[PDB]
DNA sequence: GTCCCCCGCGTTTTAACCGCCAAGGGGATTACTCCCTAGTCTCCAGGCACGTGTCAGATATATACATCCAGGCCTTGTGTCGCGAAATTCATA
């Protein structure tokens, strides 16, 4: 796939899938309990590109075993909570050989991260 | 990676203990008595040895009841394409 994926998780939510073209960001709650992700921050790093910061609404909770996918403006997807959300303020999550998607909670702590590395 | 929670250290508490006091409870000892049972015999019947009958579970089968599985059925997201609504560009009165 030419993009190595590094998965690390210390909480309940893991970064399930990252789009190489930056169309969407997919996270998974692999525990057996619902995770409240109110005002959690998603920071996307594309190599040396400036950070794109996405902020969730003040009250948001992902049910256990459910999938929420954050789509970009250029993707053309339709938001449908609690499973589908679209970030119209950003045309695309970006591209590059070093794509890093870090999930930041409301306390500014990194609990999940997945990095796409291409030789 | 997360986090929290003993660890080490400094400050307050406070009783551990060595010492001194006394009582006395009873443990140990001794003299006294008393009686319980091993020992002896006598006698006898109760549990072992043996044998035998016969049914509880081994053996076997057939059956009603709990489980995996899917097909049918209803509600919902997809696709479509002719035409309204907007602009456009120019012929011409």
From Swiss-Prot:
Domain of life according to the entry: Eukaryota
Organism: Homo sapiens
Residues the record lists as Phosphothreonine modifications: 69, 78, 83
Compositionally skewed regions (Polar residues) per UniProt: 1-8
Entry's family note: Belongs to the intermediate filament family.
Effect of residue 55 to Q: In FPLD2; interacts with itself and with wild-type LMNA and LMNB1; no decrease in the stability compared with wild-type
Self-association state and partner proteins as the record states: Homodimer of lamin A and lamin C. Lamin dimers then assemble into dimeric head-to-tail polymers. Ultimately, two head-to-tail polymers assemble laterally into a protofilament with a uniformly shaped rod of 3.5 nm in diameter. Interacts with lamin-associated polypeptides IA, IB and TMPO-alpha, RB1 and with emerin. Interacts with SREBF1, SREBF2, SUN2 and TMEM43. Interacts with TMEM201. Proteolytically processed isoform A interacts with NARF. Interacts with SUN1. Interacts with MLIP. Interacts with DMPK; may regulate nuclear envelope stability.
Tissues where this protein is expressed: In the arteries, prelamin-A/C accumulation is not observed in young healthy vessels but is prevalent in medial vascular smooth muscle cells (VSMCs) from aged individuals and in atherosclerotic lesions, where it often colocalizes with senescent and degenerate VSMCs. Prelamin-A/C expression increases with age and disease. In normal aging, the accumulation of prelamin-A/C is caused in part by the down-regulation of ZMPSTE24/FACE1 in response to oxidative stress.
Covalent cross-link site, Glycyl lysine isopeptide (Lys-Gly) (interchain with G-Cter in SUMO2): 23, 43, 59
Effect of residue 59 to N: In FPLD2; interacts with itself and with wild-type LMNA and LMNB1; no decrease in the stability compared with wild-type
Phosphoserine modifications at: 2, 4, 31, 36, 106, 119
Protein name: Prelamin-A/C
Disease listed for this protein: Emery-Dreifuss muscular dystrophy 2, autosomal dominant: A form of Emery-Dreifuss muscular dystrophy, a degenerative myopathy characterized by weakness and atrophy of muscle without involvement of the nervous system, early contractures of the elbows, Achilles tendons and spine, and cardiomyopathy associated with cardiac conduction defects.
Span covered, complete protein: 428 to 546 of 664
Stated consequence of mutating residue 114 to P: In EDMD2; mis-localized in the nucleus; does not alter nuclear size or shape
């Amino acid at each position: 796939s030419s993009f190595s994926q590094h998965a690390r998780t210390s909480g309940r939510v893991a970064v399930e899938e990252v789009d190489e073209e930056g169309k969407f960001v997919r996270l998974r709650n692999k525990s057996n309990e619902d995770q409240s992700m109110g005002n959690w921050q998603i920071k996307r790093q594309n190599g040396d590109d400036p950070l794109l910061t996405y902020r969730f609404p003040p009250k948001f909770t992902l049910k256990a075993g459910q999938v929420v996918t954050i789509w970009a403006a250029g993707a053309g997807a339709t938001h449908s909570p609690p499973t589908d959300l679209v970030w119209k303020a950003q045309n695309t999550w970006g591209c590059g050989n070093s794509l890093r998607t870090a999930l930041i909670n409301s306390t500014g702590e990194e609990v999940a991260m997945r990095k796409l590395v291409r030789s």
